[PDB]
Amino acid sequence: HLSLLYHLTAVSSPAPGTPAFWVSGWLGPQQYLSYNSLRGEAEPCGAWVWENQVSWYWEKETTDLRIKEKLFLEAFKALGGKGPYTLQGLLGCELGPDNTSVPTAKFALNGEEFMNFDLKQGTWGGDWPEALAISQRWQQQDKAANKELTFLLFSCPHRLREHLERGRGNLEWKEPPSMRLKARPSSPGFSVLTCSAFSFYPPELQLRFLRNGLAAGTGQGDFGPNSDGSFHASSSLTVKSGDEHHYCCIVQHAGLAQPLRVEL
Amino acid sequence: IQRTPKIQVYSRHPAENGKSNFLNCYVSGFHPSDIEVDLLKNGERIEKVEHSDLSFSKDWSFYLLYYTEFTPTEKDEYACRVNHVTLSQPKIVKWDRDM
Amino acid sequence: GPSVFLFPPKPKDTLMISRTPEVTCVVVDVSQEDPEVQFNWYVDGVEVHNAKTKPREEQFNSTYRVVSVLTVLHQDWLNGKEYKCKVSNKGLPSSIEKTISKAKGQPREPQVYTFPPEQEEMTKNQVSLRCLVKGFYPSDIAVEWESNGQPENNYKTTKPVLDSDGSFRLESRLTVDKSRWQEGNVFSCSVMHEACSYHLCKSLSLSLG
Ligand SMILES: *[C@@H]1O[C@H](CO[C@H]2O[C@@H](C)[C@@H](O)[C@@H](O)[C@@H]2O)[C@@H](O[C@@H]2O[C@H](CO)[C@@H](O[C@@H]3O[C@H](CO[C@H]4O[C@H](CO)[C@@H](O)[C@H](O)[C@@H]4O[C@@H]4O[C@H](CO)[C@@H](O)[C@H](O)[C@H]4NC(C)=O)[C@@H](O)[C@H](O[C@H]4O[C@H](CO)[C@@H](O)[C@H](O)[C@@H]4O[C@@H]4O[C@H](CO)[C@@H](O)[C@H](O)[C@H]4NC(C)=O)[C@@H]3O)[C@H](O)[C@H]2NC(C)=O)[C@H](O)[C@H]1NC(C)=O
């Protein structure tokens, strides 16, 4: 079922006038939280701005993410390896059946996993010297590890379960896609069939092609977000120019009771 | 590691000429985070351009949505220009309505 | 005929996530008749396009040289994926392929043994501290020396060679001033291996005595 994931990023040398540290928070595929080191405040995004939410909620989020900002920036001091650095964390939970949550705590340096947090033990681990360095610096701190334990084992499972109560609606949102199936000439004797899904939610969607009723395959896919929390997909299959009308596009989507067959 | 941007250019709603819509430039799969993105109308850059938050996928690679409110015609052309340390020249991807 | 050599990444680069491990494909004996060398790279038979080629440099033997460098993911190399450089040129019938990889097999942790200078070796300019590393697999390893933390310049290290049990062994000798060893300085043999916790192996430091 559904998950609450903080996507955290610190860079040792940010561009002029850009945050050294920023976080996006996600309920399933939707962003509900934005925070950065310039603003210093956690803010709701999209419909989560309308949420029937307790009065202190967003200063609990500011408080927790300022601790992490300071830690992430402390990590670079533990390294002193001249060349510039990006530190990323994937932190959060998903509910497990029977009043239980399964946690996530991973870290990447320069775009590769190197470190995790073990919720059973209360330590930072990894297979990598730079994991030992940051781990050790984070262990010689004001209750860093206890704050990380608290953030994941108490705060994340509560926040999640409170969003299930109050923001249930934003996630049960169902907008099926608008469809186009179009043909363009490519190389002589050949056409590109392109099947397009516009503004759909949720993002799980299966496009494939038929020819006179028969399975002609899924084509080459593609997928992207819109500015308003909806999604977009196109799949393309090369056909014989002069064969195009024998082809149709089958979409499957949580938004549709039955699959939708699109003609040219 | 370094990763080159993948670039998608698509409209929010099916492209109907004369009708208000949104042009999106989606940039994903890239590292590091510093990147420049301009949307181009008839070759010149657009001013009233907003963008989403620099976020990242399960593989740690960054992604970003650039978008503008616009009304497409029959003759007007749109593109997306992207610079990133992994590119020796800006990469233009022209908007195709097919996708 | 133009010659292709393919070099693995430095072990140290593959054991530290904040370093760039790169494979290096090298072509020599490229005739001025027709340069125009073209590289193709494959990770587990799948092509990639992140490779960087330097411009061809002329050698004093009137041939050419051309190098192409591919950065590798730390965990791809350790998971034992294959790197295939394929070189094209009109000085060959078809292209030539060379494939390089980390060696497959159950990784074993290094056993480290440090030795001080023997007393019957102490009216000499300088003294050697010996380091014996064995029982390891695969052979990718990094060995350096440090005193009271700070790194050290003067050391030689043998290439890893297979032992009668299918693990690898090597030796390293640090030369130091007899004074620095007499002044009670602490010397350490720092070994990095895949099978070691955080890739950092435990060794016992040497100090007279
Ligand atoms: C015209 O000039 C060219 C330029 O040469 C110049 O060199 C400089 C340094 C100077 O000395 C001057 O004389 C010249 O300006 C000539 O090009 C040379 O051609 C020869 C012959 O083809 C090449 O010799 C090969 O070298 C490799 C090892 O090379 C490394 O080490 C050298 C320093 O000692 C260095 O010069 C090389 O550049 C290279 O450096 C490496 O570079 C990478 C990154 O770029 C680094 O990451 C590495 O750390 C670095 N390494 C080190 C060490 O520093 C050698 O391996 C070759 O031997 C193979 O083949 C032999 C026969 O088959 C065999 O004996 C060997 O065993 C080996 O074969 C393999 O062995 C393993 C065993 O473990 C097996 O498992 C394999 O299966 C097996 N494979 C095969 C196919 O058998 C070989 O000696 C030389 O590299 C090249 N120089 C440069 C520079 O590119 C050109 O020839 C000349 N022409 C004429 C007519 O004069």
Author numbering:
A (entry chain A): 4 to 267
B (entry chain B): 1 to 99
C (entry chain H): 237 to 445
What does the paper say about this structure?
To evaluate whether the S354E mutation could indeed be used to bring T1 to a monomeric state, we crystallized T1-S354E (MFc4) in complex with FcRn. The resolved MFc4/FcRn complex structure demonstrated that MFc4 was indeed monomeric. As expected from previous work, the sequence changes from MFc3 to MFc4 resulted in a dramatic increase in recombinant FcRn binding affinity, from 300 to 5 nM. The overall structures of the MFc4/FcRn and MFc3/FcRn complexes superimpose with an RMSD of 0.35 Å over 3700 non-hydrogen atoms, suggesting a high degree of similarity. A comparative view of the MFc3/FcRn and MFc4/FcRn complex structures revealed distinct details of the Fc–FcRn interaction and provided structural explanations for the differences we observed in FcRn binding. The newly introduced Tyr434 and Leu436 in MFc4 increased the interface area from 500 Å2 to nearly 600 Å2, while adding some hydrophobicity to the interaction. Residue Leu135 in FcRn, which had been known to be a contributor of hydrophobicity at the Fc/FcRn interface, was now more involved in the presence of the Tyr434 and Leu436 in MFc4. The strongest contributors to the binding interface from MFc4 were found to be Ile253, Tyr434, and Leu436, in contrast to residues Ile253 and Thr254 in MFc3. The total solvation energy change was 5.09 kcal/mol for MFc4, a notably stronger hydrophobic interaction than MFc3, which had a total ΔiG of 3.14 kcal/mol. Using a differential solvation energy calculation for the binding interface, we were able to quantify the enhanced FcRn binding due to extended hydrophobic interaction in MFc4.
